[PDB]
Amino acid sequence: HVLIDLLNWFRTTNMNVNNCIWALKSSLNSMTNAK
Amino acid sequence: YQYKIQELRKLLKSLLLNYLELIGVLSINPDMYERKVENIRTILVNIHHLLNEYR
Amino acid sequence: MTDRLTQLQICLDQMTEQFCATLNYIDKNHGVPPEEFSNTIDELSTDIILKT
Amino acid sequence: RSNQYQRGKMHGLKQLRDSLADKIVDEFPELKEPVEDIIKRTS
């Protein structure tokens, strides 16, 4: 579980970062209209 | 009109400051970054209001 | 001749585009060598200051 | 690889905001005081 817990936590961080990047891209795409 | 000019200048300075603070938020704790993003937009939106009276 | 109000709109649009490009570069480049990244960001920040 | 990417991007962002704070202080001394508070708001 030790390796499993570290593994799951690092995975969660990874796709949280990926989701943040995608949200940034979506926000810029949406807000380009208001530019 | 000088009041509007100085309001626009201070709003631009505050917009730059808030952009710096928001990118710092993205740097350290981006999870809540949107909490400031729309805020900055409001200032930008206010800028548009400041254009409306100048029309 | 070009009216200065149209120039002001062009300048603000260019400023918005420059911020979008700078943040896109930051998002897609964070992780490129640190020295080249720092130099490019210094150039972008100088561009921000000049546009201001 | 993901952890190394995270650490590298954290270092990059740290240097980004350090340089930006330094230059904002330089060309805009009147906004120097909030900028440090911004660091206090972030760090």
Curated annotation (Swiss-Prot), chain A:
Localization annotation: Nucleus
Role of this protein: Component of the Mediator complex, a coactivator involved in the regulated transcription of nearly all RNA polymerase II-dependent genes. Mediator functions as a bridge to convey information from gene-specific regulatory proteins to the basal RNA polymerase II transcription machinery. The Mediator complex, having a compact conformation in its free form, is recruited to promoters by direct interactions with regulatory proteins and serves for the assembly of a functional preinitiation complex with RNA polymerase II and the general transcription factors.
Family of the protein in this entry: Belongs to the Mediator complex subunit 14 family.
Other noteworthy facts: Present with 319 molecules/cell in log phase SD medium.
Record's protein name: Mediator of RNA polymerase II transcription subunit 14
Entire-sequence positions represented here: 160 to 194 of 1082
Curated annotation (Swiss-Prot), chain B:
Record's miscellaneous remark: Present with 7598 molecules/cell in log phase SD medium.
Keyword vocabulary terms for this entry: Activator, Nucleus, Transcription, Transcription regulation
Record-stated family: Belongs to the Mediator complex subunit 7 family.
Keyword Cytoplasm: no
Shown residues within the full chain: 112 to 166 of 222
Function noted in UniProt: Component of the Mediator complex, a coactivator involved in the regulated transcription of nearly all RNA polymerase II-dependent genes. Mediator functions as a bridge to convey information from gene-specific regulatory proteins to the basal RNA polymerase II transcription machinery. The Mediator complex, having a compact conformation in its free form, is recruited to promoters by direct interactions with regulatory proteins and serves for the assembly of a functional preinitiation complex with RNA polymerase II and the general transcription factors.
Cellular component terms (Gene Ontology): core mediator complex; mediator complex; nucleus
Lineage: superkingdom: Eukaryota
The name this protein goes by in its record: Mediator of RNA polymerase II transcription subunit 7
GO annotation, biological process: negative regulation of transcription by RNA polymerase II; positive regulation of transcription by RNA polymerase II; positive regulation of transcription elongation by RNA polymerase II; positive regulation of transcription initiation by RNA polymerase II; regulation of transcription by RNA polymerase II; RNA polymerase II preinitiation complex assembly
Single GO MF descriptor: transcription coactivator activity
Subcellular location: Nucleus
From Swiss-Prot, chain C:
Compartments reported by the entry: Nucleus
Transmembrane segments: none
UniProt function note: Component of the Mediator complex, a coactivator involved in the regulated transcription of nearly all RNA polymerase II-dependent genes. Mediator functions as a bridge to convey information from gene-specific regulatory proteins to the basal RNA polymerase II transcription machinery. The Mediator complex, having a compact conformation in its free form, is recruited to promoters by direct interactions with regulatory proteins and serves for the assembly of a functional preinitiation complex with RNA polymerase II and the general transcription factors.
Extra facts: Present with 1391 molecules/cell in log phase SD medium.
UniProt subunit comment: Component of the Mediator complex, which is composed of at least 21 subunits that form three structurally distinct submodules. The Mediator head module contains MED6, MED8, MED11, SRB4/MED17, SRB5/MED18, ROX3/MED19, SRB2/MED20 and SRB6/MED22, the middle module contains MED1, MED4, NUT1/MED5, MED7, CSE2/MED9, NUT2/MED10, SRB7/MED21 and SOH1/MED31, and the tail module contains MED2, PGD1/MED3, RGR1/MED14, GAL11/MED15 and SIN4/MED16. The head and the middle modules interact directly with RNA polymerase II, whereas the elongated tail module interacts with gene-specific regulatory proteins.
Included stretch of the parent chain: 1 to 70 of 140
Swiss-Prot record, chain D:
Superkingdom of the source species: Eukaryota
Disulfide-linked positions: none
Compartments it resides in: Nucleus
Described function: Component of the Mediator complex, a coactivator involved in the regulated transcription of nearly all RNA polymerase II-dependent genes. Mediator functions as a bridge to convey information from gene-specific regulatory proteins to the basal RNA polymerase II transcription machinery. The Mediator complex, having a compact conformation in its free form, is recruited to promoters by direct interactions with regulatory proteins and serves for the assembly of a functional preinitiation complex with RNA polymerase II and the general transcription factors.
Additional detail: Present with 1472 molecules/cell in log phase SD medium.
Similarity remark: Belongs to the Mediator complex subunit 10 family.
Protein name: Mediator of RNA polymerase II transcription subunit 10
Record organism: Saccharomyces cerevisiae (strain ATCC 204508 / S288c)
Gene behind this protein: NUT2
